[PDB]
UniProtKB/Swiss-Prot annotation, chains A, B:
Substrate binds at residues 54-59, 145-147, 167-170, 179, 279-285. It comes from the Eukaryota. This is N-acetyllactosaminide alpha-1,3-galactosyltransferase. It is found in: Golgi apparatus, Golgi stack membrane. Its cofactor is Mn(2+). Keywords: Glycoprotein, Glycosyltransferase, Golgi apparatus, Manganese, Membrane, Metal-binding, Signal-anchor, Transferase, Transmembrane, Transmembrane helix. Glycans are attached at N213. One of its GO terms (molecular function) is metal ion binding. Synthesizes the galactose-alpha(1,3)-galactose group by catalyzing the transfer of a galactose residue, with an alpha-1,3 linkage, on terminal lactosaminide (Gal-beta-1,4-GlcNAc-R) disaccharide borne by a glycoprotein or a glycolipid. Preferentially glycosylates proteins, can synthesize galactose-alpha(1,3)-galactose on glycoproteins but cannot synthesize the glycolipid called isoglobotrihexosylceramide or isogloboside 3 (iGb3). The chain holds residues 81 to 368 of 368 of the full protein. The conserved DXD motif is involved in cofactor binding. The manganese ion interacts with the beta-phosphate group of UDP and may also have a role in catalysis.
Length: 288, 288
């Protein structure tokens, strides 16, 4: 029969951290997952996993290659994977060598004038690509920032209907300290006294159906704000958090899946699967 | 289960041409296949189809783009396809936009000094790639020349264990007129009095297992001839023909699947799926 949470998830292996949400969704931490059981189950379902990534402007030279090279080596090893790359200058797209079960597909996109819109417009573009082709090509999809690098296996244990990432700096913080959009005028507004976690927009996924809804609702909020002459504090991330507050994710990833070494390396982070690239806004951004 | 030939192949539709061999293999002509029945069959088995193509030197600028643009449009439509592109200079590789169910993988290869060796080395390289990864990615694979363009649907009706292509200029000729290698000193030698058809090396395919044997055996003959100071009249094509004589293909494609318009367009050619590019050796080749 079907896959059951206990088949692959054992929360008691990590008693010192949050492994379950009040809506019964698991928070995946190193040690709680049985990847062997899942690689088997999914192999028999012959699944294919997609991964979208954008690189506009200097983000191409600065991060695209490192991102893809690491993704090839660590993302969903043992299963067919398709990398969907969106850049503004395809002549700069690095055609590095891919390994077994990896393939790519590159798309030329318009570069928005403000880096903020470059970051936010991703929600619209992803939705279009899901409708146009991704829904027909994969069973699950992850959408990620390019300014990060895979450090270890990021596999099937991360798959789910809708998947969210716990932002590294706030996983232990109280919701009322979260950097949610606090202005009622914004569609991303979340009042004090509300919120479960602070999700990182650098990583999110799920089935194409769920990701389409996530990206569609987020872009609708982004456009609504533009009509009301307001822009969320943390752009599409603020909208993503509003979305995940209303539509609880079926799976959350621990900070081990998107860690910022600037924090150092505390006891809770047992095995880092991905790490943030140091910020270099002075050079990679050309406005604000 | 159990796909039977009559399920999709009806020879009586083309009574004026050879539609069946003496060893039970069908010769696919326009009108004889039921692609609808096959598409449904293969869709249920969730097959993926691979296509390899080499472009070394000026063949890249002259033919790679056109080849890929046409393949994207007509090759195995409705099914997952992976294009494996082998070039010697990835920077000149045209990265065209691909449509639904199409994805790429590019590899940098060494350019052999003689065009004859570039053409023949393909047999070795394909074999290496099948073992390293293609055998784990596709159910069927086609290996094609780059100096041609898809003109119409080239689909599932072409799939089989081992697939051979009839050369457009000799499909009606007698075996003794075929341009086989007639020197007994060559591993590709075929005596007068023998032979079924003259196969084109511009197109051949089958399951990864079969293509691995086709390629490995041809290359062995190629290396042997080098040890005996002889080079087949039509290079790897001569060896391919010797191979298909000993190991009969389970399916053959009519000239409609690889036609040369310089012959003109006779009544037998009902619907062209692929056409030869005009030869331009003076520019694309650097040695006699
Ligand atoms: C505690 C604290 O203030 N920590 C900040 C981090 O939050 C910050 O990361 C940024 O966080 C915002 C959300 O608040 C968003 O996720 C950004 O994309 C992310 O980069 C970090 C940045 O260097 O500095 C810490 O001091
Ligand atoms: C009748 C005749 O000689 N026709 C030739 C074609 O055969 C020839 O095509 C070449 O054929 C050889 C095998 O004989 C091999 O397949 C080559 O790759 C192929 O290009 C054609 C070439 O322009 O000229 C005709 O006159
Ligand atoms: O000028 C830009 C701005 C953004 N991005 C994309 O948008 C993501 C989010 O922006 P950024 O990473 O800079 O935000 P941060 O995490 O730093 O907050 C990046 O990873 C890129 O993929 C880009 O390519 N070029
Ligand atoms: O210098 C060369 C010679 C050959 N090829 C490859 O080998 C195939 C066979 O060579 P060619 O087409 O020129 O042979 P022909 O059909 O003309 O006889 C080509 O389509 C290319 O894919 C190449 O890329 N560069
Ligand atoms: Mn980022
Ligand atoms: Mn050719």
């Amino acid at each position: 029969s079907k896959l059951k949470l206990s088949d692959w998830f054992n929360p008691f292996k990590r008693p010192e951290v949050v492994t379950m949400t009040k809506w019964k969704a698991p928070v995946v931490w190193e040690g709680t997952y049985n990847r062997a059981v899942l690689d088997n189950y999914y192999a028999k379902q012959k699944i294919t996993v997609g991964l979208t990534v954008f690189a506009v402007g200097r983000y191409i030279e600065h991060y695209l290659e490192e991102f893809l090279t690491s993704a090839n080596k660590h993302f969903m090893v043992g299963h067919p994977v398709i990398f969907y790359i969106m850049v503004d200058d395809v002549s700069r797209m690095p055609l590095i060598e891919l390994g077994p079960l990896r393939s790519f597909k590159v798309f030329k996109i318009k570069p928005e004038k403000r880096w903020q819109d470059i970051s936010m417009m991703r929600m619209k573009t992803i939705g279009e690509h899901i409708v146009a082709h991704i829904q027909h090509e994969v069973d699950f999809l992850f959408c990620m920032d390019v300014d990060q690098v895979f450090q270890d296996k990021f596999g099937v244990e991360t798959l789910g209907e809708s998947v969210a990432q716990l932002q590294a700096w706030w996983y232990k913080a109280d919701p009322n300290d979260f950097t949610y959009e606090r202005r009622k005028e914004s569609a991303a507004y979340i009042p004090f006294g509300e919120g479960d976690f602070y999700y990182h927009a650098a990583i999110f996924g799920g089935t194409p159906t769920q990701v389409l809804n996530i990206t569609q609702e987020c872009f609708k909020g982004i456009l609504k704000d533009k009509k009301n002459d307001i822009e969320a504090q943390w752009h599409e991330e603020s909208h993503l958090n509003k979305y995940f507050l209303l539509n609880k994710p079926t799976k959350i990833l621990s900070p081990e899946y998107c860690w910022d070494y600037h924090i150092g390396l505390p006891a809770d982070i047992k095995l880092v699967k991905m790490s943030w690239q140091t910020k270099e806004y002075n050079v990679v951004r050309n406005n604000v």
